[PDB]
Amino acid sequence: MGRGSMEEFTIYTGTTVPLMNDNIDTDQILPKQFLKLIDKKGFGKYLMYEWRYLDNNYTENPDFIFNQPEYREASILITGDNFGAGSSREHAAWALADYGFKVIVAGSFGDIHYNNDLNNGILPIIQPKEVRDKLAKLKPTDEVTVNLFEQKIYSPVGDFSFDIDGEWKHKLLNGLD
């Protein structure tokens, strides 16, 4: 990833993966050594690097949830509080986008990271902990629809409203950067 280009977001459907830790900081999302790479590179393979691999040869950690067979095409991330705080790192959004995340549902986000996600084809969502724990118990095959016109999430575990600033809404719904 690289663009910083506004991609259209209206209604999106995908399956989910839960990783419910608080304070997944930009360093955990995309380690500092990878900031040496130019923005034409793919960052997907570096996403969550230290959780995801056992060594420096890309041997997958078979315990990391993203690697689990049922979750390898998940496009909607359910997490904890304060996702993406710490050193400002637009590359961390590129990693998430390049991997294939379109939506993230958290307790809260780092301020810059929130903007970086929105500027790189991800919709970051704030939900209360009660809903995020419901979403975390979805089946890997369960579809979830996010409808930005309605500001609603639909799932087998419930349907939920969310807030978003009207200006972000206008930019996402239209093709607009």
Q: Which residues contact residue 174 at a Cβ distance below 8 angstroms, ignoring those fewer than 6 apart?
A: 8
Helices marked H in the chain — which ranges?
Answer: 26-29, 49-52, 90-99, 111-118, 129-136, 166-173
Nearest to 106 by CA among 131, 78, 84, 130: 78
Q: Which residues contact residue 38 at a Cβ distance below 8 angstroms, ignoring those fewer than 6 apart?
A: none
62, 69 contact by CB (below 8 A)? no
All structural domains of the chain, each given as residue ranges with its CATH number in brackets, are: 1-177 (3.20.19.10)
Beta bridge partners of 147: 11, 152
Resolution of this PDB entry, in A?
2.1
Using the CB atoms, write b or e for 56-79: b if 16+ within 10 Å.
Answer: eeeeeeeebbbeeeebeebbbbbb
